[PDB]
Amino acid sequence: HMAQVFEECVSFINGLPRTINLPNELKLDLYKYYKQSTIGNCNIKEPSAHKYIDRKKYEAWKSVENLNREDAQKRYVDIVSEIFPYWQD
Ligand code: NI
Ligand code: NI
């Protein structure tokens, strides 16, 4: 059942008022699990470490290499639930 739960969680995040701002480490965690859930293992070329943020995103994603889709969705959903328990209401 994780796939549909995950889709809804993503929608909830996507819909957040453009006002709410989350800290970067949290955003990165959401990001890496989002990528690992949807695309799977990192599949792009390593960006230059000179492009700081793009590189940080790359390494975050790379760091969850080999986590299957279901565990990645669960981790994404657990992080969101931690901050927004009512997200699926
Ligand atoms: Ni199921
Ligand atoms: Ni430069």
GROMACS .gro file of N, CA and C and ligand atoms in nm:
model
  269
    1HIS      N    1   0.082  -0.127   0.000
    1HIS     CA    2   0.000   0.000   0.000
    1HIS      C    3   0.084   0.130   0.000
    2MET      N    4   0.215   0.120   0.018
    2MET     CA    5   0.299   0.239   0.024
    2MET      C    6   0.293   0.333  -0.095
    3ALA      N    7   0.285   0.279  -0.215
    3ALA     CA    8   0.281   0.363  -0.334
    3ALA      C    9   0.172   0.470  -0.332
    4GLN      N   10   0.049   0.433  -0.297
    4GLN     CA   11  -0.058   0.533  -0.295
    4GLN      C   12  -0.045   0.627  -0.175
    5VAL      N   13   0.006   0.576  -0.064
    5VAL     CA   14   0.026   0.658   0.055
    5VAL      C   15   0.133   0.761   0.017
    6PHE      N   16   0.241   0.714  -0.044
    6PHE     CA   17   0.351   0.801  -0.084
    6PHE      C   18   0.301   0.911  -0.180
    7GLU      N   19   0.222   0.873  -0.280
    7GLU     CA   20   0.172   0.971  -0.377
    7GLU      C   21   0.096   1.082  -0.308
    8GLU      N   22   0.014   1.046  -0.211
    8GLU     CA   23  -0.062   1.145  -0.137
    8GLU      C   24   0.026   1.237  -0.053
    9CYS      N   25   0.133   1.181   0.005
    9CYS     CA   26   0.226   1.255   0.089
    9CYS      C   27   0.300   1.359   0.006
   10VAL      N   28   0.341   1.317  -0.113
   10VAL     CA   29   0.411   1.401  -0.210
   10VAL      C   30   0.319   1.518  -0.245
   11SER      N   31   0.193   1.487  -0.276
   11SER     CA   32   0.093   1.590  -0.308
   11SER      C   33   0.080   1.687  -0.193
   12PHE      N   34   0.073   1.634  -0.071
   12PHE     CA   35   0.061   1.720   0.046
   12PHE      C   36   0.179   1.813   0.057
   13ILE      N   37   0.298   1.761   0.029
   13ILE     CA   38   0.418   1.844   0.038
   13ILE      C   39   0.413   1.947  -0.077
   14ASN      N   40   0.390   1.898  -0.198
   14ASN     CA   41   0.382   1.986  -0.314
   14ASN      C   42   0.285   2.102  -0.292
   15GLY      N   43   0.181   2.078  -0.213
   15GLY     CA   44   0.080   2.178  -0.190
   15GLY      C   45   0.101   2.274  -0.076
   16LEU      N   46   0.202   2.251   0.007
   16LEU     CA   47   0.228   2.339   0.121
   16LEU      C   48   0.224   2.486   0.083
   17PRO      N   49   0.170   2.571   0.171
   17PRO     CA   50   0.168   2.712   0.134
   17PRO      C   51   0.312   2.748   0.099
   18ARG      N   52   0.330   2.827  -0.006
   18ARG     CA   53   0.464   2.866  -0.048
   18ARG      C   54   0.534   2.943   0.065
   19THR      N   55   0.463   2.961   0.176
   19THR     CA   56   0.516   3.033   0.292
   19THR      C   57   0.602   2.949   0.385
   20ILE      N   58   0.553   2.830   0.420
   20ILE     CA   59   0.625   2.740   0.509
   20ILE      C   60   0.761   2.707   0.451
   21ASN      N   61   0.866   2.721   0.532
   21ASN     CA   62   1.000   2.688   0.487
   21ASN      C   63   1.065   2.591   0.583
   22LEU      N   64   1.117   2.482   0.529
   22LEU     CA   65   1.181   2.380   0.612
   22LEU      C   66   1.332   2.389   0.605
   23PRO      N   67   1.401   2.349   0.712
   23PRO     CA   68   1.547   2.357   0.706
   23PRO      C   69   1.606   2.267   0.594
   24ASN      N   70   1.719   2.309   0.539
   24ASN     CA   71   1.785   2.238   0.431
   24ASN      C   72   1.818   2.090   0.452
   25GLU      N   73   1.863   2.051   0.570
   25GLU     CA   74   1.893   1.910   0.591
   25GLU      C   75   1.766   1.826   0.581
   26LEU      N   76   1.655   1.884   0.622
   26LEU     CA   77   1.529   1.815   0.619
   26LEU      C   78   1.484   1.810   0.474
   27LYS      N   79   1.501   1.920   0.401
   27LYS     CA   80   1.462   1.922   0.262
   27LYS      C   81   1.543   1.819   0.185
   28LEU      N   82   1.671   1.810   0.217
   28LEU     CA   83   1.757   1.715   0.148
   28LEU      C   84   1.715   1.572   0.171
   29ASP      N   85   1.674   1.542   0.295
   29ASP     CA   86   1.629   1.407   0.329
   29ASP      C   87   1.505   1.375   0.251
   30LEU      N   88   1.411   1.469   0.247
   30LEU     CA   89   1.287   1.449   0.171
   30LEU      C   90   1.323   1.428   0.024
   31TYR      N   91   1.414   1.512  -0.025
   31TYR     CA   92   1.462   1.503  -0.163
   31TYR      C   93   1.522   1.366  -0.203
   32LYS      N   94   1.618   1.319  -0.125
   32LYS     CA   95   1.683   1.192  -0.157
   32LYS      C   96   1.587   1.075  -0.157
   33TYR      N   97   1.494   1.071  -0.061
   33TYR     CA   98   1.395   0.962  -0.056
   33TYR      C   99   1.294   0.978  -0.168
   34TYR      N  100   1.265   1.102  -0.202
   34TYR     CA  101   1.175   1.127  -0.313
   34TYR      C  102   1.239   1.069  -0.441
   35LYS      N  103   1.364   1.104  -0.467
   35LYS     CA  104   1.431   1.051  -0.586
   35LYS      C  105   1.442   0.898  -0.588
   36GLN      N  106   1.486   0.840  -0.476
   36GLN     CA  107   1.503   0.696  -0.463
   36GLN      C  108   1.370   0.621  -0.475
   37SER      N  109   1.261   0.687  -0.436
   37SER     CA  110   1.128   0.626  -0.447
   37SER      C  111   1.079   0.626  -0.591
   38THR      N  112   1.091   0.741  -0.656
   38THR     CA  113   1.042   0.756  -0.792
   38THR      C  114   1.132   0.704  -0.905
   39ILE      N  115   1.261   0.737  -0.904
   39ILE     CA  116   1.349   0.693  -1.011
   39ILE      C  117   1.429   0.571  -0.972
   40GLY      N  118   1.467   0.564  -0.846
   40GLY     CA  119   1.547   0.452  -0.801
   40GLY      C  120   1.691   0.498  -0.789
   41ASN      N  121   1.787   0.406  -0.802
   41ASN     CA  122   1.927   0.446  -0.789
   41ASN      C  123   1.963   0.571  -0.869
   42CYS      N  124   2.055   0.651  -0.815
   42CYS     CA  125   2.096   0.774  -0.883
   42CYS      C  126   2.131   0.739  -1.030
   43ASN      N  127   2.070   0.808  -1.125
   43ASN     CA  128   2.096   0.774  -1.265
   43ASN      C  129   2.150   0.887  -1.352
   44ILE      N  130   2.201   0.992  -1.290
   44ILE     CA  131   2.256   1.103  -1.367
   44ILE      C  132   2.406   1.108  -1.347
   45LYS      N  133   2.472   1.192  -1.426
   45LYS     CA  134   2.617   1.206  -1.415
   45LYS      C  135   2.651   1.293  -1.292
   46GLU      N  136   2.763   1.263  -1.229
   46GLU     CA  137   2.808   1.338  -1.113
   46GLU      C  138   2.828   1.485  -1.154
   47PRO      N  139   2.757   1.579  -1.089
   47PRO     CA  140   2.777   1.719  -1.128
   47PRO      C  141   2.908   1.769  -1.067
   48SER      N  142   2.958   1.882  -1.116
   48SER     CA  143   3.082   1.933  -1.058
   48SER      C  144   3.056   1.976  -0.915
   49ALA      N  145   3.154   1.954  -0.828
   49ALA     CA  146   3.140   1.991  -0.688
   49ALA      C  147   3.144   2.144  -0.676
   50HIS      N  148   3.167   2.211  -0.789
   50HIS     CA  149   3.168   2.357  -0.794
   50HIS      C  150   3.022   2.410  -0.791
   51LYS      N  151   2.928   2.326  -0.835
   51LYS     CA  152   2.786   2.360  -0.832
   51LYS      C  153   2.742   2.302  -0.697
   52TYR      N  154   2.771   2.376  -0.591
   52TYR     CA  155   2.743   2.333  -0.455
   52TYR      C  156   2.612   2.262  -0.427
   53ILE      N  157   2.501   2.330  -0.450
   53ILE     CA  158   2.372   2.270  -0.421
   53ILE      C  159   2.343   2.149  -0.507
   54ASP      N  160   2.364   2.161  -0.637
   54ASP     CA  161   2.340   2.048  -0.726
   54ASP      C  162   2.424   1.931  -0.678
   55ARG      N  163   2.546   1.958  -0.633
   55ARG     CA  164   2.632   1.850  -0.585
   55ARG      C  165   2.578   1.788  -0.456
   56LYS      N  166   2.528   1.872  -0.366
   56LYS     CA  167   2.472   1.823  -0.241
   56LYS      C  168   2.352   1.734  -0.268
   57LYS      N  169   2.273   1.770  -0.368
   57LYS     CA  170   2.154   1.693  -0.403
   57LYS      C  171   2.200   1.560  -0.458
   58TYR      N  172   2.301   1.565  -0.544
   58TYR     CA  173   2.356   1.443  -0.601
   58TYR      C  174   2.405   1.346  -0.493
   59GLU      N  175   2.487   1.394  -0.400
   59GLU     CA  176   2.538   1.305  -0.298
   59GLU      C  177   2.429   1.251  -0.205
   60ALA      N  178   2.326   1.331  -0.177
   60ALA     CA  179   2.217   1.286  -0.089
   60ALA      C  180   2.150   1.165  -0.155
   61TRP      N  181   2.115   1.181  -0.281
   61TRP     CA  182   2.053   1.075  -0.359
   61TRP      C  183   2.145   0.951  -0.367
   62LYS      N  184   2.271   0.973  -0.403
   62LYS     CA  185   2.368   0.865  -0.411
   62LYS      C  186   2.376   0.791  -0.279
   63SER      N  187   2.364   0.864  -0.169
   63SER     CA  188   2.377   0.798  -0.040
   63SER      C  189   2.267   0.698  -0.009
   64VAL      N  190   2.153   0.704  -0.078
   64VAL     CA  191   2.047   0.605  -0.051
   64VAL      C  192   2.042   0.499  -0.160
   65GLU      N  193   2.153   0.486  -0.232
   65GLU     CA  194   2.165   0.387  -0.339
   65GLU      C  195   2.128   0.248  -0.285
   66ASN      N  196   2.053   0.171  -0.365
   66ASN     CA  197   2.013   0.034  -0.328
   66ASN      C  198   1.903   0.015  -0.222
   67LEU      N  199   1.833   0.123  -0.189
   67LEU     CA  200   1.722   0.115  -0.095
   67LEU      C  201   1.606   0.085  -0.190
   68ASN      N  202   1.522  -0.014  -0.161
   68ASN     CA  203   1.413  -0.035  -0.257
   68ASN      C  204   1.305   0.073  -0.248
   69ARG      N  205   1.221   0.080  -0.351
   69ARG     CA  206   1.116   0.180  -0.359
   69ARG      C  207   1.026   0.188  -0.236
   70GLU      N  208   0.984   0.073  -0.182
   70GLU     CA  209   0.897   0.075  -0.065
   70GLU      C  210   0.962   0.132   0.062
   71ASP      N  211   1.088   0.098   0.088
   71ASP     CA  212   1.155   0.150   0.207
   71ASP      C  213   1.180   0.301   0.193
   72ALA      N  214   1.204   0.346   0.070
   72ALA     CA  215   1.229   0.487   0.044
   72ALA      C  216   1.100   0.567   0.062
   73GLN      N  217   0.989   0.510   0.018
   73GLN     CA  218   0.861   0.578   0.035
   73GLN      C  219   0.826   0.586   0.185
   74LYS      N  220   0.850   0.476   0.257
   74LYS     CA  221   0.821   0.475   0.397
   74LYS      C  222   0.901   0.579   0.471
   75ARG      N  223   1.029   0.591   0.438
   75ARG     CA  224   1.113   0.691   0.505
   75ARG      C  225   1.066   0.833   0.472
   76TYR      N  226   1.027   0.857   0.348
   76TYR     CA  227   0.976   0.989   0.308
   76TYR      C  228   0.853   1.021   0.394
   77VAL      N  229   0.757   0.928   0.392
   77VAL     CA  230   0.632   0.945   0.467
   77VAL      C  231   0.654   0.960   0.619
   78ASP      N  232   0.749   0.885   0.675
   78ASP     CA  233   0.780   0.895   0.817
   78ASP      C  234   0.836   1.034   0.850
   79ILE      N  235   0.925   1.088   0.767
   79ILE     CA  236   0.978   1.221   0.794
   79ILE      C  237   0.861   1.322   0.791
   80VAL      N  238   0.778   1.318   0.687
   80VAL     CA  239   0.665   1.411   0.682
   80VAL      C  240   0.573   1.396   0.805
   81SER      N  241   0.539   1.272   0.841
   81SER     CA  242   0.452   1.245   0.956
   81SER      C  243   0.508   1.301   1.084
   82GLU      N  244   0.640   1.305   1.092
   82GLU     CA  245   0.712   1.356   1.207
   82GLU      C  246   0.681   1.507   1.225
   83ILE      N  247   0.676   1.579   1.113
   83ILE     CA  248   0.649   1.722   1.114
   83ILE      C  249   0.501   1.759   1.097
   84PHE      N  250   0.429   1.683   1.015
   84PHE     CA  251   0.288   1.708   0.989
   84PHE      C  252   0.208   1.580   1.011
   85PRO      N  253   0.183   1.542   1.138
   85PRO     CA  254   0.107   1.420   1.170
   85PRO      C  255  -0.029   1.407   1.101
   86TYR      N  256  -0.095   1.520   1.081
   86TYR     CA  257  -0.228   1.530   1.019
   86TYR      C  258  -0.228   1.536   0.866
   87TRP      N  259  -0.110   1.529   0.805
   87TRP     CA  260  -0.100   1.540   0.660
   87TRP      C  261  -0.199   1.461   0.576
   88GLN      N  262  -0.235   1.341   0.619
   88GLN     CA  263  -0.325   1.261   0.538
   88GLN      C  264  -0.472   1.274   0.572
   89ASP      N  265  -0.506   1.367   0.661
   89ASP     CA  266  -0.645   1.383   0.701
   89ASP      C  267  -0.731   1.456   0.598
   90NI      NI  268  -0.028  -0.309  -0.001
   91NI      NI  269   3.210   2.937  -1.059
   0.00000   0.00000   0.00000
